[PDB]
């Protein structure tokens, strides 16, 4: 009998402690198919853990990783409808429910750059409203108030050429109010 990882007619097969081969399941960090065959550079849905997989092309799931415009998350799920951290990019993304990556959009309240990156304490030129947004420490997009000497409106567009804020502040065409005080 034989036990372990065995290469035969060119793919992977794992034989379990009785001698027999493992089939539809995991073994470590490697999916075993339906055949027996390991998995390799592939994407497998596991019904029992409701989440797709990537085997990568040493047959290891992918984690904390890309692939394409999807991304494994630390328990090796691809992420669906989600927001996650890359601690390597040190970067919010959010995962559409297909699994893509939101890019150049709004997502609520946020919005994701052009590689998917969050915006975040920093404005941003939303090419399509033809408008400035402010994203305040934690993403979220500021309304109703200042950012310095601009000032966001109700729907965090920025003022331009109006008076805001309770019709006390004059900010000119660019944007800015300009202080002069006594
Ligand atoms: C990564 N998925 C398998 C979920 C979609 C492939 O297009
Ligand atoms: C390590 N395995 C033997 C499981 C596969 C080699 O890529
Ligand atoms: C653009 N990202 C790097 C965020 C994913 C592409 O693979
Ligand atoms: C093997 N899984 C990927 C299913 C869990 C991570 O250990
Ligand atoms: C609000 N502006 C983008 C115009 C200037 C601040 O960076
Ligand atoms: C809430 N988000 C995950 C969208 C950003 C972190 O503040
Ligand atoms: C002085 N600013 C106009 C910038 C803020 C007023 O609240
Ligand atoms: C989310 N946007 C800033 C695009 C609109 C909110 O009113």
Redesign the pocket.
């Known amino acids: 009998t034989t036990s372990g990882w065995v290469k035969q007619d060119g793919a992977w097969y794992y034989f379990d402690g009785n001698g027999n081969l493992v089939k539809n399941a995991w073994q470590g960090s490697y999916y075993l198919k339906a055949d027996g065959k390991m998995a390799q550079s592939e994407w497998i849905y596991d019904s029992s853990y409701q989440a797709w997989y990537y085997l990568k092309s040493d047959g290891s799931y992918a984690k904390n990783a890309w692939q394409g415009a999807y991304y494994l998350k630390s328990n090796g799920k691809m992420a669906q409808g989600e927001w996650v951290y890359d601690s390597s990019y040190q970067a919010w993304y959010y995962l559409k429910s297909d699994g893509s990556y939101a890019r150049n959009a709004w997502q609520g309240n946020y919005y994701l750059k052009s590689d998917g990156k969050m915006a975040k304490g920093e404005w941003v030129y939303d090419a399509t409203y033809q408008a400035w947004y402010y994203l305040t420490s934690d993403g979220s997009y500021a309304y109703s108030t200042?950012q310095?000497?601009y000032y966001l409106k109700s729907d965090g567009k920025m003022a331009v050429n109006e008076w805001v804020?309770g019709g006390r502040?004059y900010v000119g065409a660019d944007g800015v109010?300009k202080?002069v005080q006594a």
């Open positions: 200042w310095g000497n804020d502040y109010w202080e």
